[PDB]
Structures are given as structure tokens and as C-alpha cells.
Amino acid sequence: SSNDNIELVDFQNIMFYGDAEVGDNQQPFTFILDTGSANLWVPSVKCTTAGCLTKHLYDSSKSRTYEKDGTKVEMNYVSGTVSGFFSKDLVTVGNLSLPYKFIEVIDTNGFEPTYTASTFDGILGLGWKDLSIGSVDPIVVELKNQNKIENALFTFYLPVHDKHTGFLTIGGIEERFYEGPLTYEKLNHDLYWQITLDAHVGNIMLEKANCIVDSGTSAITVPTDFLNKMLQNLDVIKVPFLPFYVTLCNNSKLPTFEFTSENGKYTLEPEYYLQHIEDVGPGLCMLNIIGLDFPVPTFILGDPFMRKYFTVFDYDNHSVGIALAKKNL
Amino acid sequence: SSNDNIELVDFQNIMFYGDAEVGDNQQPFTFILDTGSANLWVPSVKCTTAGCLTKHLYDSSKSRTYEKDGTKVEMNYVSGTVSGFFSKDLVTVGNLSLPYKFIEVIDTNGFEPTYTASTFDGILGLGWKDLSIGSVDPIVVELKNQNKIENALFTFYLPVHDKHTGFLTIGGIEERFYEGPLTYEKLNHDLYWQITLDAHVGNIMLEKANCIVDSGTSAITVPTDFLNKMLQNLDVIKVPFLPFYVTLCNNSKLPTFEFTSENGKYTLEPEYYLQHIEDVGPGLCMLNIIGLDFPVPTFILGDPFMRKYFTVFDYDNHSVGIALAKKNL
Ligand SMILES: COC(=O)C[C@H](O)[C@@H](NC(=O)[C@H](C)NC(=O)C[C@H](O)[C@@H](NC(=O)[C@@H](NC(=O)[C@@H](NC(=O)CC(C)C)C(C)C)C(C)C)C(F)(F)F)C(F)(F)F
């Protein structure tokens, strides 16, 4: 130990959260720690909306370090919208802290059913400045420019359901989380953590695909046409009009995703992208895969990928490191 | 015979489609005939997306009546987006015709993976002018102004799978499609075909609910909070990651929707709204009740409702007629 950690807690097989706090009096919250966005928000005590009922709420008045701002903001996600206003106050992650600009959400009705169904309070973005609203410097970037950490990087070791918990480590790389070598891939842009890889599945290939490493996405996301050809004569049922794909867990035709570069080769075998749905039926699984088209052909390497591979997110060197995650700590 | 009858084909009691043409040659197409939108669109031959490759495409230069417009349009739906540009031509629906402004589509990826996985080419909207983009007067309104039909009204008798085909009748009500009395409900706005009903499922009551009668919605759609209360007295299986649920189709505890007004009482039993997934497991079903929040608390009575109830869409009298559909022609 030397860097600062944030324990990640598996939430009943789906998502993982981590705790951080806001205000010089602390005030704990539960966050989706999300490399796929770049704003921090937190539900306000001035929230009037149904979704806030079960949530930890933020009270600026109990904070001596609070600094009013009040500029209105709307925060858009694939899964919904959340509005409020900007504020500034001490944000604390691990036992690192800094004065930080963030959003006090007072309206969450555009974020249902997700927000009421989930136990997170807010979202802590870990992307790049250009992805943000209100041009906020990333937390880890600001910490390094204030010399509170050695390196402007952070690291994800995801929790696995029954096996172990996870860690978001800020400031340095720890050998204990991985096996074999790290391989680094340079970002094609400073926005999401997006790198370029050849994507190969069947005898289907997409050369030079834009791949986004996104901790806040619970699936592997794939281009629509690519997904469509992938499932051609696998024996997988797409329930009509739903992104709901069902197979025998044992289906011997299920392919392995292969993403390659000059530096390395990363695979995702069926065991990493399948979710058991035994309650639905015996020996049944669902593909934790969504079809999604971007302007440029794009995969999101979400949690199923990051469950297999320990990842390093390096702002200084503009790259992502990838290595096999240790099965047990 | 006397009115314009357009045959409807079933897909698995999930959705239905009907054909119509563009240009003075046939150039046939399969549409979602959709009371929940107010635009017509067809995929251009100038569309090269992977979805368009499997569809009937519209060649504007194989038809004398084409009149270019060229203006860009983004058509937005709850379930997806389609982009293209305005054009004008002869739209032939059944045995009637009219010069009509419509969208030639060149980008379909915003509506995938649904588009490619279904058999429709485009969407023919049957809503009101104010719901449209490009302020286009509805086909049926214009068809009445041109005295090609008796009444500015159309009618839906939806097909049911191993039982009968259906019909969209333009111009008048025909006794053969229903039994019992027709009951009229006034529109609360000239936008969607939206009326006001008290919605209750046994103690969960949402009085004066805004109810949209939408032929291009495959579900019953419901306020998120309302769905949560219904789920409280059920014990069904949540599909991981997705807002969908799996039941046995014969689950006796499944809710019967009740919708009352001064004028009448409408119910919808599980046998109408459930989506069978026999190919995943015997007796298995998707709930097919979908949480969806609008600015105003709203229900979408989609195909499940309209398979049970013959419906009448009356522009002249600003209302919706409802009657029990005949079980067989
Ligand atoms: C100016 O506006 C802009 O800067 C960009 C724009 O607003 C853009 N927004 C974004 O790109 C923002 C910043 N980031 C994001 O949208 C990406 C995040 O990782 C997001 N993730 C998501 O919304 C992802 N959703 C999920 O993972 C959810 N899980 C499920 O729905 C299960 C399915 C994926 C099977 C979780 C319960 C959250 C999808 C599949 C990508 C979450 F974590 F929720 F915050 C968007 F709205 F999507 F269009």
C-alpha cells in the first residue's frame, strides 16, 4: 500500500459501486465509478423528485467549504437524464481530497426506472475533460497537478460475485491485481478511454475499430451489423423486438471475441460474456451483449471485459494498460 | 365493399404490418401502420446501410410523379431514430391515391437492431398534424378533403395469429369487425390518439390517466411507479440488466388491466398482453408491460389492447371508438 484505494462492492451480480464523499463534514455517497463519462453528480437535499427518496442526499449548508455557483445543467446518459446545478466543495476519494466542481441534482425523473431500482446515489466520471459539461478537469488530473499523487493514473480491479471484492486505485500500479505483463494501448482521442483494435469474432472482422473501455457499461457493446452476422447460425434466440439473447450455456458454437493490436491480443470467451438465467430455464444463459451503432464502428469493452482484464487508465501517457486480472487476491 | 380496405398480416401476435406503395409504378412496401406517429417514411435506394440491404428500397427516378424537396429530417421515436430527407410522390394505400409529402431515409442505424430483425421497410404514421414533422396533414384528412372517402376516420381490426387476418379500413365503420356497442371517448389533445381513462389494476389506481392508443407499440406501456406497484404483488423473474420480466403464461396472479370512463369499461387480461416465448421454454412468457415515464402520467395501449378491441379513429369528431373485436370474420 502507498496509493489510495476505493473498495468496489458487487451489487447482486450486476453492477459495482464505490463510496466517496462531498463536503468538509464528509457526507458519504455511493457512486457508479464511470470511465465512460467526466462529471461528478450527487443528489441534493433540494431534490423534490420520487427517485431521491432512498438516496443519500447532499446538504451544502452543513459544509464550511461549500462555494455557491448555481449554473443550471442537464446531464445526458444513454440510460437517462438528470438535471440540477453546479456547486463546488471538498470531494474526497479514499483519503485523497480536493476542492471540486460537481452537480447537485434536484430532478431525476428522466433517469427512471434505473435510479429507483438501484442503490447508487450518484455518478463519478473518470473520463477526459472534453467529455465533460462545464469543462471540469478530471479528479485524477487535478490531484496530480496539486501533487497529491505520484502519477495521474487510476486502476480497475473489478469485484467477482462470490469470489472477491474489487478496487479502484488512484496514483499507482499495484502488482497484486494482475498476472503476466501489462500491455499499453495509446488513446486515439482524449475523450473516452478509446483505443484502436482489430475486432475478430467468427470469420467476421472489423479492422481498426474504435474500442471504448467503460466501467459504467454493464455489457459488451458491439456494432449492430457485426452482432447480426455473429449470431447468424449460432443457436441463439433473439426474443422479438428485445435485446434479449438466450442460449444453452453449453452451446458449443459460441464464439470467442478477439481484439488485437501490434502490442497484444485480448480475448473474451463465452464464460465472460454469458449470464446464467437458470430461473428462466434449466441450463439457460443470456448474452450480456448489446448492439449499438456509433458514427464510427465502435465496441464498448464494459464490465464483462474489465472483469477478465485488470486495466490501467493513464492520463500522463494518454493510454490504457491491460493485463490478466488475478483470479484471487 | 364501399370503403378502402387494406389487409394486415400478423407477426406472432407481437406486431402487425400492411402494404402500401410510392411512385406511379408500384414500388411496394411493408409498413408499421402507426397511430402513434404522423409521418410516412420509406428507405431510399440511396441508403447503403446493412439494414437497407435487406429491404425494399425506393427509387425516386423510376417514377414520373416524383418532385424533389431535399430538406433534411430527423424522425424521432421512443424506440429509435431514422434520418433522411423530404420528397413528394404518389402514395397508393389500398385502392386510393394522393400526392403526399414523405421521408426518403438514408440512415437506419439509430433503429437497429430492431429494423434488420423485422420485416417492415418503413413506417406509415396515422396521427394528427401537430405530431408530425414538416406539418404534413394526415393521409385520411386529405383523402376526405378530396372527397375520395365518406368520413375522415379510419378503423383497425388487427389480425390474431392462428385465427384471422386484419384490416385497416379508411372512410367508414363496418359492422363485421366488432360485436356489441361502440363506445366513443373524446381526445384530450389533437396530437396522439390520446384519451382520458381511469387505469386500475386492483388497488393501484391512477385516475384520469392519459392513454395513447398506438398501433405501432408492441407492449402495454405504463408509468414506471405504476409498474413498480404491480410488481409488488407478483413473483416473476427479472431479466438481468434489462427492464423485462418472465412468467409462466398461466400465472393466475397476473393483473387484468381495467380502464373506465363515464362511457364504458375496458379490460385487458394476461392472454392479450403477454408475449409468448415458447421457443425459450414451454408455457413461458414475457410480461410485456413496460415502464415508460412521460411528462404527464401516461399509458400506451398498444397492439395487445387493439387485438382485443376494434378501434375507430375519428378526425371529424375528435375521438376514438372502442368495441370488442369479432373473434373471427
Ligand atoms: C453533450 O453530451 C455529451 O457530452 C455526450 C452525450 O450526451 C452522450 N452521453 C455520454 O456519452 C455520457 C457522458 N456517458 C455515458 O452515456 C456512458 C456511461 O458509461 C453510462 N453508461 C450507460 O448508459 C450504459 N448503460 C448500462 O450499463 C446500464 N445497464 C443496462 O441498461 C443493461 C444493458 C447495457 C444490457 C447501467 C444500469 C447504467 C450503456 C449501455 C452505454 C452510465 F454509466 F450510465 F453513466 C449520450 F447521452 F449518450 F448521447
Ligand SMILES: COC(=O)C[C@H](O)[C@@H](NC(=O)[C@H](C)NC(=O)C[C@H](O)[C@@H](NC(=O)[C@@H](NC(=O)[C@@H](NC(=O)CC(C)C)C(C)C)C(C)C)C(F)(F)F)C(F)(F)F
Ligand atoms: C409529441 O411529439 C413528440 O414528443 C415527438 C418525440 O420526438 C417522440 N416521438 C414520438 O412519440 C413518435 C412521433 N412516435 C413514437 O415514438 C411511437 C411510435 O408508435 C413508435 N412506437 C414506439 O416507439 C414504441 N416501440 C415499440 O413498441 C417497439 N417494441 C419494442 O421495442 C419492445 C419494447 C416495447 C419492450 C416496436 C417493435 C418498434 C415505444 C414502446 C413507444 C413506432 F411505431 F415505432 F414508430 C420521442 F422521440 F419519443 F421523443
